[PDB]
């Protein structure tokens, strides 16, 4: 794909609502698609000003499978989708009743990926790890990719690590849709490592770094 180069730029815009708290997020990043790495800086603006009202980790994974190292042989569903574009839909089912739904569109112009998302979370316990910001980040995960009904699906039981050392379970279910038909890959897995680094006390300013590599199973 002559459209996806070795070095890419990214820009993000998110409109969201968690437990009634409205917010918007802006971000900018840089990435190496073939190497499976990317880093970005985000700014969360709560509708009512003030610090981030919940754990940024519920948003991190929403902020691009094109940033995955795929073996040169295997069909790269994500890379093939450009320049037409892709849409993503993800369900997050947390173990304590909290549920978040997120949907986003990724477009590309030149070396720049524009990511526009909508995020909505409800029913998180007022004192749980999400609302109390007790999480540290996602443990490495192996997302199972399967082809289902012409599109690629991703399923994985992920874990958000907690301050004291515990873990908080989240089931992820995602639909990866392409604007145009692409050559489908075989069922596989994507190993991902995502690290979050708060830049300010409130957590409104934050950095994310991710490394992802696909494995033939």
The verdict on 183 binding its own copies (CB under 8 A) reads: no
> What is the size of the binding site for its own copies (CB under 8 A)?
46
Query: Closer CB to its own copies, residue 85 or residue 202?
Result: 85
Query: Closer CB to its own copies, residue 41 or residue 93?
Result: 93
Tokens of 168: 């908080």
The verdict on 175 binding its own copies (CB under 8 A) reads: yes
The verdict on 169 binding its own copies (CB under 8 A) reads: yes
The verdict on 120 binding its own copies (CB under 8 A) reads: yes
Alpha carbon 72 to its chain centroid, in Å, reads 24
With residue 60 as reference, give the H or E element that holds it. helix 57-60
User: Rounded to whole angstroms, how far apart are CA atoms 177 and 14?
Assistant: 19
Query: Closer CB to its own copies, residue 30 or residue 101?
Result: 101
As measured in angstroms, the least distance from the Cβ of 151 to its own copies is 9
User: Rounded to whole angstroms, how far apart are CA atoms 215 and 35?
Assistant: 14
DSSP-derived 3-state class of residue 217: coil
The verdict on 189 binding its own copies (CB under 8 A) reads: yes
Select from 30, 83, 84, 105 the one that contacts its own copies (CB under 8 A): 105
User: Over 87-150, what HEC string results?
Assistant: EEEEEEEECCCCEEEEEEEEEEECCEEEEEEEEEEECCCCCCCCCCCCEEEECCEEEEEEEECC
With residue 59 as reference, give the H or E element that holds it. helix 57-60
Binders of its own copies among residues 60 to 99 (CB under 8 A) are 87, 89-91, 93, 97, 99
As measured in angstroms, the least distance from the Cβ of 155 to its own copies is 4
User: Rounded to whole angstroms, how far apart are CA atoms 1 and 23?
Assistant: 36
Instruction: Catalog residues that contact its own copies under the rule CB under 8 A.
Output: 17, 19-20, 22, 87, 89-91, 93, 97, 99-103, 105, 118-123, 125-126, 139-142, 144, 146, 148-149, 155-157, 159, 166-167, 169, 171, 173, 175, 177, 187, 189, 217
């Amino acid at each position: 794909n002559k459209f996806i180069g070795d070095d890419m730029k990214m820009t993000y815009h998110m409109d969201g609502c968690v437990n009634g708290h409205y917010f918007t997020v802006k971000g900018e990043g840089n990435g190496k698609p073939y190497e499976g790495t990317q880093t970005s800086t985000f700014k969360v603006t709560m509708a009512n000003g003030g610090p981030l009202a919940f754990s940024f980790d519920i948003l991190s994974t929403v902020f691009n499978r094109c940033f995955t190292a795929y073996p040169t042989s295997m069909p790269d569903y994500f890379k093939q989708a450009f320049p037409d574009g892709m849409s993503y839909e993800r369900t997050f089912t947390y173990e304590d009743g909290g549920v978040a739904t997120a949907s986003w569109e990724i477009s590309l112009k030149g070396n720049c990926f524009e990511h526009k998302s909508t995020f909505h979370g409800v029913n998180f316990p007022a004192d749980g790890p999400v609302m109390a910001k007790k999480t540290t980040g996602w443990d490495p995960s192996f997302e199972k990719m399967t082809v289902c009904d012409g599109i690629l699906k991703g399923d994985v039981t992920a874990f958000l690590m907690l301050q004291g050392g515990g873990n908080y379970r989240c089931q992820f279910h995602t639909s990866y849709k392409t604007k145009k038909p692409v050559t489908m890959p075989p069922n596989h897995v994507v190993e991902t490592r995502i690290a979050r680094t708060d830049l300010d006390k409130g957590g409104n300013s934050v950095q994310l770094t991710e490394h992802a590599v696909a494995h033939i199973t």
